[PDB]
Design a protein around this motif. Sequence first.
Motif, mmCIF file in Angstrom:
data_model
loop_
_atom_site.group_PDB
_atom_site.id
_atom_site.type_symbol
_atom_site.label_atom_id
_atom_site.label_comp_id
_atom_site.label_asym_id
_atom_site.label_seq_id
_atom_site.Cartn_x
_atom_site.Cartn_y
_atom_site.Cartn_z
ATOM 1 N N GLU A 1 0.811 -1.215 0.000
ATOM 2 C CA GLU A 1 0.000 0.000 0.000
ATOM 3 C C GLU A 1 0.850 1.272 0.000
ATOM 4 O O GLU A 1 0.570 2.212 -0.751
ATOM 5 C CB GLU A 1 -0.930 -0.001 1.214
ATOM 6 N N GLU A 2 1.869 1.321 0.855
ATOM 7 C CA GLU A 2 2.702 2.521 0.936
ATOM 8 C C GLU A 2 3.522 2.660 -0.337
ATOM 9 O O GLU A 2 3.608 3.741 -0.911
ATOM 10 C CB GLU A 2 3.647 2.487 2.143
ATOM 11 N N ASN B 1 3.197 6.259 -6.937
ATOM 12 C CA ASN B 1 2.027 6.526 -7.773
ATOM 13 C C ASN B 1 1.579 5.330 -8.620
ATOM 14 O O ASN B 1 1.195 5.477 -9.782
ATOM 15 C CB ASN B 1 2.287 7.735 -8.678
ATOM 16 N N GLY B 2 1.646 4.140 -8.035
ATOM 17 C CA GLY B 2 1.040 2.967 -8.630
ATOM 18 C C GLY B 2 1.878 2.302 -9.701
ATOM 19 O O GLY B 2 1.394 1.413 -10.396
ATOM 20 N N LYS B 3 3.129 2.734 -9.839
ATOM 21 C CA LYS B 3 4.023 2.180 -10.854
ATOM 22 C C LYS B 3 5.314 1.662 -10.240
ATOM 23 O O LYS B 3 6.107 2.431 -9.698
ATOM 24 C CB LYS B 3 4.338 3.239 -11.911
ATOM 25 N N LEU B 4 5.522 0.352 -10.332
ATOM 26 C CA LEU B 4 6.721 -0.270 -9.794
ATOM 27 C C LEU B 4 7.455 -1.018 -10.898
ATOM 28 O O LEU B 4 6.919 -1.962 -11.462
ATOM 29 C CB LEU B 4 6.377 -1.238 -8.659
ATOM 30 N N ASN B 5 8.672 -0.587 -11.204
ATOM 31 C CA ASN B 5 9.490 -1.281 -12.196
ATOM 32 C C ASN B 5 10.111 -2.573 -11.680
ATOM 33 O O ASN B 5 10.238 -3.552 -12.419
ATOM 34 C CB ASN B 5 10.595 -0.359 -12.683
ATOM 35 N N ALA C 1 1.575 -2.007 -14.411
ATOM 36 C CA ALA C 1 1.366 -0.603 -14.754
ATOM 37 C C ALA C 1 2.652 0.093 -15.202
ATOM 38 O O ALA C 1 2.598 1.050 -15.967
ATOM 39 C CB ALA C 1 0.754 0.145 -13.581
ATOM 40 N N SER C 2 3.804 -0.380 -14.731
ATOM 41 C CA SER C 2 5.065 0.263 -15.094
ATOM 42 C C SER C 2 5.375 0.072 -16.573
ATOM 43 O O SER C 2 6.051 0.900 -17.181
ATOM 44 C CB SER C 2 6.224 -0.267 -14.245
ATOM 45 N N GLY C 3 4.886 -1.024 -17.149
ATOM 46 C CA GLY C 3 5.116 -1.316 -18.553
ATOM 47 C C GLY C 3 6.405 -2.084 -18.796
ATOM 48 O O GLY C 3 6.587 -2.698 -19.853
ATOM 49 N N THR C 4 7.305 -2.033 -17.815
ATOM 50 C CA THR C 4 8.549 -2.799 -17.842
ATOM 51 C C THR C 4 8.868 -3.288 -16.429
ATOM 52 O O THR C 4 9.439 -2.567 -15.606
ATOM 53 C CB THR C 4 9.732 -1.974 -18.416
#
Lengths: 246, 246, 246, 246
Positions: free
Chosen positions: C79-80, C86-90, C136-139
């Motif tokens: 959550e943190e 902002n919801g994007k993790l590579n 969401a990161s796309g990569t």
Amino acid sequence: SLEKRWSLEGTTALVTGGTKGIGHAIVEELVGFGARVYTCSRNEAELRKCLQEWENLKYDVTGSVCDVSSRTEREKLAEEVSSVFNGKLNILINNAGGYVNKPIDGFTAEDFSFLVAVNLESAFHLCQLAHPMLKASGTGSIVHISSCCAQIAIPGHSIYSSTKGAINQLTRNLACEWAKDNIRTNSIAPGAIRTPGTDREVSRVPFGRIGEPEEVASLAAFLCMPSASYITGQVICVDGGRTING
Amino acid sequence: SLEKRWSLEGTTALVTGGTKGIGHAIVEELVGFGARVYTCSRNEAELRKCLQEWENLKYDVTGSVCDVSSRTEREKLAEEVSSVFNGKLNILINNAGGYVNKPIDGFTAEDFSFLVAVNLESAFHLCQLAHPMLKASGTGSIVHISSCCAQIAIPGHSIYSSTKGAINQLTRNLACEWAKDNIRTNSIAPGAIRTPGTDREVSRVPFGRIGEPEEVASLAAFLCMPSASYITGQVICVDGGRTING
Amino acid sequence: SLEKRWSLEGTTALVTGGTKGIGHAIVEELVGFGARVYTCSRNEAELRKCLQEWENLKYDVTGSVCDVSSRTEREKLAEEVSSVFNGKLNILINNAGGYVNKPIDGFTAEDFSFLVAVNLESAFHLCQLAHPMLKASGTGSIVHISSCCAQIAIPGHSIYSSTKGAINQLTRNLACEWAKDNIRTNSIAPGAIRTPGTDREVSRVPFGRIGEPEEVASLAAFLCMPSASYITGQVICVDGGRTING
Amino acid sequence: SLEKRWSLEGTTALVTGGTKGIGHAIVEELVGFGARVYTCSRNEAELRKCLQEWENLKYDVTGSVCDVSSRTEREKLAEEVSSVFNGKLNILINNAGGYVNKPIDGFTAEDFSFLVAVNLESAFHLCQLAHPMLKASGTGSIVHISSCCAQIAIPGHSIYSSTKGAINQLTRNLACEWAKDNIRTNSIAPGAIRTPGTDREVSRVPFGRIGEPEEVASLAAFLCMPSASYITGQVICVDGGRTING
Ligand SMILES: NC(=O)c1ccc[n+]([C@@H]2O[C@H](COP(=O)([O-])OP(=O)(O)OC[C@H]3O[C@@H](n4cnc5c(N)ncnc54)[C@H](OP(=O)(O)O)[C@@H]3O)[C@@H](O)[C@H]2O)c1
Ligand SMILES: NC(=O)c1ccc[n+]([C@@H]2O[C@H](COP(=O)([O-])OP(=O)(O)OC[C@H]3O[C@@H](n4cnc5c(N)ncnc54)[C@H](OP(=O)(O)O)[C@@H]3O)[C@@H](O)[C@H]2O)c1
Ligand SMILES: NC(=O)c1ccc[n+]([C@@H]2O[C@H](COP(=O)([O-])OP(=O)(O)OC[C@H]3O[C@@H](n4cnc5c(N)ncnc54)[C@H](OP(=O)(O)O)[C@@H]3O)[C@@H](O)[C@H]2O)c1
Ligand SMILES: NC(=O)c1ccc[n+]([C@@H]2O[C@H](COP(=O)([O-])OP(=O)(O)OC[C@H]3O[C@@H](n4cnc5c(N)ncnc54)[C@H](OP(=O)(O)O)[C@@H]3O)[C@@H](O)[C@H]2O)c1
């Protein structure tokens, strides 16, 4: 039924290098389950002595002198086997091999050529030559005798292990390409075994001992039985845990 | 001699989950070679039906209801087996398992806990409990029933395959740590097998068919025979070439 | 172009257990290539000390106290991270782990539960929780820190190695199921590494020495770079040849 | 420090087969990190064209015509490289290879000889020839370009895959025997890659695409960096998950 699944009655087999060591154990194991066996070696005098002992025991074993590192001799061998067995071969055991132990720096071109010819090309060509007979049997089993050192690094074994690594892969290709012909192909990868061909090794074996020829021969016979009908493409180590021991 | 090497006469065995599928085949294969077998399942009515059929056939099979996912029940099971067999167990077959098929996103904490308990913890704890009896027999054989999908990715199998991957590793540790006690440990990794528990799979199998329970049971019996005395720490796929097929 | 392929500029990363040893090295390696990193540990005082040192060096690292063996805490952590990034993790690096060294006979139910929770369930659940951000990161790149002993038997490592063996398999399932989401998953399997967490081992290493944390961290960073775009589902040992040495 | 660990500045390298495909990508990747590269091919006109383009870009690349399947030419090649680099070679990339696609039944003795010579003997002999230069550098890295199909069965690949399987094993022997000389040896095993050398394959790839030459070249460069100092004896697949996909 169980009795049939665990029998080699009425089968025919070719075992290369059957006059000593692992190959000799494999011949006896196979005839023990009712197979008719054809075998060979480069030594005329040792082969006749083996064949005479087996005929004394009423085993159905025949054989001829053949250097499996020679293409012409392999072709001749496949010709006799096909005639003796009337074109039907259930079992092919590629046991004949060669061994050189040198540091990588020490290996000669001649060493390389010798090991590739006897450990890899011989097995490959004999599978090719035997394919019609194996297919014709309706139930074919190819077993390569590899080595557990095709998965780890043993001092001096670089080219030896590499040729056995090639055999391990060839096993997978044979298994898949000839499944359609109801032929199975597997590899047995022994650790150190007590043989005419053969300190720190046994220290690396959880069991603390080298293996015996029959400890390889039993699995070879099992893999040829109807009981092994869903086993193909596998490389099975018979090494008392040598390769997985920390 | 050959006859002895290929026999389970006078041996004692525990097979978990013996009322159906692979486990049922394993019980019959073992008694076929002369073993006395103890087995179990969670279903009282199905177990008595199996035991009655076996007693009708004069097989020496006994058993009790046991959920091997329960610690207390595992302890109780090991207690009865040790009493029935007078503290000597030759063979332990960890066959009971569980299966959930979901995408990774779908798995619940409860799914995870269930699969770990029945596929991994059960086998581990039972090996612990059985170690004195196995050691006392003087010739011990543990066989885990794993899965060939512990080497590849099958849709929906993530936690299932991961628990079987854990079993494959545990096999290696058992093999090495208890070699001193003349106990061998191996894993059989089936592909898809026709069972009460069980399109695109068979397309991936070179043989083009699923396996039969006896095609796994035969290898389980072989691995417990004296003939397998130098085989330990191995994971052997019985999958018609599924995992090595391109 | 080369410059871009070998960069982590503009990426976001979660590294579990980043206050010591391998995890600490991984955080620094990632920020060295321009990543923004989130990390955690169970120790509040050690984490603030690490975060303060990193802020002094103008690295973009943030973090919170989290015991990844707790489901509620894992959920809170995800959550943190999702809010901070902002919801994007590579990048997700599952480094936090646990270790118990006992003979198989010695392991308790509590030992088993502890190792499964921290080495396997934690990684699995965090992948689930992180999947939307990774997608969401796309990569996306997931790297598990496994162990080279998930392929061999080291005395005392039975449950530890088995949980890492499970991780190795999970790697393959993640790699295949989430390839569609342009997420790659790989495992790094260290040999013995000099860490706060850590004779006969180094004798088994061809290099004759234990590894350093940065010798693992470098590969972790590489596997997250665009340069690694066709590498997925792999288990790569970083062990100076330990596991393949005879 | 990070900068040094991720650099090939001041290093010297030999890449066989650098005028096309993967080898060409590897040359450019290596010079990109500051290496001085020597390369070769059998085609005089294509090599001069490549060398001219590289000199236009101020890359330090030199080369000569060499058929690495010829012993005399390999010896000549190692002689020039040693003179040009003053007897110090950091990097050896055995990339030159050969490919034949036929069913097992179709392979000729000439096919077999060709594949063994170019895929296995060439790499082996060049390692021998290069050992003094590699040892003299003080930091040596050998990278073989193998194939992911040395672990599975692809139709038509039997001898090709078997020679690459041999390379995979040789990797392990080199890694262990020459660790003392601070030389590391690893294998990169590509899946299908878009090359001048190169439907159902991409269906088997989780990523649903073939790879690009730079997706192999990046890992080759990484394995030669100081950052890879504890990585040796490994076979790393670069195949988008091809070999572990169910
Ligand atoms: N023993 C071990 O520790 C060990 C370990 C791993 C793998 N292996 C493998 O197991 C297999 C058998 O090994 P072994 O130790 O039993 O060997 P062995 O005791 O030396 O017996 C070899 C047999 O093969 C025959 N032979 C050798 N070269 C031949 C050729 N070119 N053509 C025809 N026959 C030939 C030999 O007879 P002639 O010499 O009279 O021809 C002898 O009958 C080999 O593939 C070997 O690599 C052995
Ligand atoms: N079938 C396959 O295709 C396949 C493939 C790979 C691996 N396997 C593995 O092979 C093994 C056997 O599978 P199977 O397909 O034969 O299963 P099955 O047909 O469902 O038979 C399972 C047996 O185990 C018993 N059992 C299940 N859970 C149990 C528990 N918690 N405690 C005690 N007994 C239990 C069942 O009886 P109750 O339900 O009455 O208890 C039944 O006797 C398993 O480990 C499975 O993972 C199977
Ligand atoms: N070191 C080796 O030789 C070696 C070899 C093979 C594999 N590995 C694996 O490499 C990884 C890192 O090992 P390491 O040796 O670097 O460990 P380490 O030196 O003990 O560092 C572990 C880090 O993880 C944190 N941590 C531990 N348990 C945690 C939990 N439940 N929740 C959150 N954070 C936790 C620790 O901080 P707190 O304790 O403060 O939480 C510390 O930051 C592990 O997965 C380990 O199994 C290590
Ligand atoms: N491409 C793939 O899909 C793939 C997959 C797995 C593995 N591989 C392996 O990757 C490596 C590179 O493959 P590639 O596809 O990049 O090949 P490629 O596109 O055909 O390029 C091969 C290069 O090697 C040179 N070469 C070939 N034979 C040679 C010889 N005997 N002596 C000197 N130079 C020689 C070629 O030039 P000349 O012909 O002018 O000599 C060319 O420069 C090979 O080891 C191959 O087996 C490739």
